[PDB]
Amino acid sequence: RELKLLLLGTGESGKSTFIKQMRIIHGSGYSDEDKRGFTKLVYQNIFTAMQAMIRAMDTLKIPYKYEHNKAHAQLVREVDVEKVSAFENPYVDAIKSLWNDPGIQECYDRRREYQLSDSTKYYLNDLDRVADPAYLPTQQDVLRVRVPTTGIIEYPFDLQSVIFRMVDVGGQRSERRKWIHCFENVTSIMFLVALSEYDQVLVESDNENRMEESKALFRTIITYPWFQNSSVILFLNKKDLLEEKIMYSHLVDYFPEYDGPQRDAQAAREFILKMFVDLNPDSDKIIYSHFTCATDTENIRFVFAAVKDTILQLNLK
Amino acid sequence: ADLEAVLADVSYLMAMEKSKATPAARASKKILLPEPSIRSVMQKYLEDRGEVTFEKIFSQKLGYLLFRDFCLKHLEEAKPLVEFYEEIKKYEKLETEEERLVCSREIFDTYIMKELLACSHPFSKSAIEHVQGHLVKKQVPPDLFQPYIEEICQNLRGDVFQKFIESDKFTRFCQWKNVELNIHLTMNDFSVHRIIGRGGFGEVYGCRKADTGKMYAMKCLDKKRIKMKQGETLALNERIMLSLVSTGDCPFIVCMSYAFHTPDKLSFILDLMNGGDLHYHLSQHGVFSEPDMIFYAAEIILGLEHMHNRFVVYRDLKPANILLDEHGHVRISDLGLACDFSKKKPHASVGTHGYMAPEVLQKGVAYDSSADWFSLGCMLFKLLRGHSPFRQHKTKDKHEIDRMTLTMAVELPDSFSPELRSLLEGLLQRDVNRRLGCLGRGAQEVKESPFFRDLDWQMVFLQKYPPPLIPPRGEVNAADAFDIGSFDEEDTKGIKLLDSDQELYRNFPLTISERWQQEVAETVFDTINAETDRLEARKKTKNKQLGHEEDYALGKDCIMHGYMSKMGNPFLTQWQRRYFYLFPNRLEWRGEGEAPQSLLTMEEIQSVEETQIKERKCLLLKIRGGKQFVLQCDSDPELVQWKKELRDAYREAQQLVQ
Amino acid sequence: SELDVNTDIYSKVLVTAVYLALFVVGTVGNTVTAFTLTVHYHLGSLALSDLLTLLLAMPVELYNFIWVHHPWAFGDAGCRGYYFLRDACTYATALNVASLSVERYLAICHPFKAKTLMSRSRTKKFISAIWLASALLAVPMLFTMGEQNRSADGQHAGGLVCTPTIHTATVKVVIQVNTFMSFIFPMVVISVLNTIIANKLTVMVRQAAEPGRVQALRHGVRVLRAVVIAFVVCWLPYHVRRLMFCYISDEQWTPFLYDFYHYFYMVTNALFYVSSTINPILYNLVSANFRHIFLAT
Amino acid sequence: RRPYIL
Ligand SMILES: COc1ccccc1C1CCN(c2nc(C3(F)CC3)nc3ccc(N(C)CCO)cc23)CC1
Ligand SMILES: Nc1nc2c(ncn2[C@@H]2O[C@H](COP(=O)(O)OP(=O)(O)O)[C@@H](O)[C@H]2O)c(=O)[nH]1
Ligand code: ALF
Ligand SMILES: [Mg+2]
Q: Which residues of chain D lie closer than 8 angstroms to C2, CB-CB?
């Protein structure tokens, strides 16, 4: 009855964000209790970002500008999110002072040297409103919250006239091994790759570029013999991150083969798309690609409007 | 039948059927493995002949079992490799593509796709791409994972094999190998049941090996009768042929496991085909039909192909020589008259009248494996008619049957289909150059004949077809022991066996490694291993509690060490068993274990030579100054290695001191 | 004082005919059995024991015990030696039957054990100990008495009567011990071993359900029971007469009891010899393979 | 009248 889909990609790529967007558009919008729960999630995300960037500053031995905030920094090291609660007054001022500190700002601008959530800037801009006790996060705040998924999570859903069940899976290397069991009757595969992953290395490995791992995984998935009868769609996510990363980072250093002009977001996107589509072994196969940004509802709407039609045309029964 | 015959038959049948579900329980004797200290000698013994390489051990049944169980339990890194290899081997035996499809998909997902997703796959891109290309096209040949087999073997050949060698399970392999190389069979080792056949130089009895319980067929040849009929050459030729064809895996020939001799008998240990010969079953059941004889002809053709590939000509091919196993599959049994034509083509008229080729029956003219095809034709004719194409014994005189050289086969039109008429016309050709199977590739010329057009030879080799006849399970399937009878003992009176005659059989005894290892693996490998492990656990606890460990680091420069019996003292115990250590300059000597002490210095040695004492092999060391020592070892391999190493040690020490 | 027997002439003829008719069979067939033939050694040994029991013992009785009672031919040493031979043969036969039972039981129930415990040399040692060695050890105290002239004829040969001279207490004790050694012990071992083997054979028959094998095992168990039945029916009368010679609470015998006891002696010794004649008949019946060779030889 | 034969 209902067709089975997979959302595949390396960790942090953005699969769960697309699941949230699909639920929001063609499902049930999140309720007040949902946002109340997500408030704590946002709180621990902010705490994790603060701790990670302080640890990065320490490892990189970058001096601080504010001596007083150093005390707060120590307090930051003492905060533990296992026995977590709502944000408290003594922490909001310290976080604001740290974020306003130019030294840690430069450290974050150098974020390529360590792992960090892409939502850090958004929450930092939010500042008091998010940290305000009267926290009423909007759909954007809920979408821009990071919660590492793990294990196979089937998400039943249906279109206006057809039923298409999705499957969200983890992207961490240790967890990918668990996909064996979700390939039983795949009707079409959606693959997510972070356009901005070209600069950051994996989390599980600090020496392998994320884009190389993503390309290897895409090749491995296409090489699967039993997917020959299933369509594949390559969602190029996080274009809004890449349009700034390229402006701030040169794609030549990551992949020198991209000899195109610098600062051209469209050129870099086209180069990445060509590089990924080239990995297919046999040209008779067709690969559909769509630039997108899971954090924007309109882009997901537009992409899905055609993805559903393509899937329906692919499977006539 | 009388009470005694009934009791003998019942005992034989019950011993044959006893504890079928638990073969380990059939053993009345127990294999006693040597102490774990054996590896110090056996390792050098095996190294000196290059037998500790990965291929040599991994190709042995017991070596493979020990290596597998080491990897699966004592080395985490090697566990996935051995599991993958074992499941590939299991897959290779799947007989249908419908099952191979699912098996191959499961193997791929479990051992390839998972690792690729986790990027933990160590295998080369070539094997991955080969398997992917085969599977994407829905092809599932048995050779799918052969590149993976090669790469798994390459990976295991590395540090995994070195760790295995350094482990305590290579010690178990050394113990089992020492037990193997010390096989000295006697008539006591077997429980001989009633006679099942007679002919040639002696009789055939069913028997059960004492220390494993496996049922065998013991073929005994009397030395006195052999001498009386000048059959020593034939007796040795039979052993040569049996050892030549037994080494392999052909399931269409009665393979030989052991060969030994008592002071008066030569004995071969062979597979027990408890179903009985095909002639007895033909008499009971009557003439077979063409679809029934298809099975026997195919199996016998494969057997002859196996024999001919080794250049052995099976001159006596009769229905009587074809033995049905328990399930009804046939095997070729009597290699008494078989000969080798690789060196020179025989010319003797050896066979059975009515089944001998015209060139065999012709005097002086040489012949090759071509003889076996004429005999195959004659045999297949009998299965369908109850007698040879030429008159039978009761129908004509022996030389009247020999007129086969002056006629042509009848080739009946009634009982044979046109395809069978063509087959028999080809097999019974008078001219060798024109006869089927005597030209071109040989066995292929027959296997491709129209009569076998419907038959799939791969399933014949795998023995998937249902036998036409299943022997009764409640009978001996042989003539009464009274009917079989026995040779006249008076005929041997006046025959005496000189020492020069017993010398003809000095090198006769033999044991085939793969056959013994397979027997042990089937029957008593796990039981013995567990008992052995308990024994070493007990002794290790005893030594740890009471001190006096097995060895205190084996010294600093010990060449080799092991138990030996300081021998020959009349005023003390003759067998003064002690523990010895060998060093390039001296040979030390230890008591019950408290403290080693020097017994001898290599610089003193004059010569080292073997000697026989009390009918037991021993080592004799002569010392400068008239002194001497006698040492006796437990296994021939210990004696051989001790002799070699002592000789090399003192020779090198004295040459350097020169 | 009865000097000569009061037995009837009719009995003197009928019992003598019975004795000779049993003698012919137990000589011819027993010698043929010995010629025909590791159990076979035991079968031949028992055949030899029975042949001796008959040939050596029976002829002396006639005209001295059967046809007459007054005169005794052999001297005191002669009578002592005759009783020695009689008792040695009896003990040998009984113990050899027991040895056959145990040997066959070991061979059938646990053949692998029999291969060692019943080695050819070991079997030779056991048979030598039992036959011609074991018998001579138990008889000396049991048959070395006789030549007690009690008949009033005195000097006349008819007056000299042979009889165990031991005192009533000692003689009774030794007869009791003789019966214990020759009857209860081998009867016990034979009965228990034969019962075990019969149980095994009956189990086999129940599981066997072939007609030839069924017939063979049925006849085997039937003969195994008939062996003990024959043993009791032929030996118990002999030992009972021998005991009631001594196990009597008084010295008073009525003349009718005297004649009845003499007739009982005749029939009991006839049965004792019948026991020795039986063995070849059962050997032939129980084995066709042996039957054909026996008839051929 | 005690007998004598055995
Ligand atoms: C306890 O056995 C006695 C005791 C007293 C007298 C005779 C016997 C015989 C009973 C029958 N017999 C045999 N019994 C058995 C049994 F124990 C019941 C299985 N298997 C045999 C097998 C052969 C054989 N022969 C005469 C050999 C001729 O070739 C005799 C027996 C020999 C002893
Ligand atoms: N700015 C931006 N952030 C994104 C986009 N897609 C995903 N993210 C963020 O990336 C974070 C991790 O994505 P996640 O949901 O874990 O994807 P998954 O690893 O496949 O489950 C989330 O907190 C998202 O807010 C995008 O297109 N633009
Ligand atoms: F990398 Al994820 F859920 F954050 F698979
Ligand atoms: Mg997720």
A: 1
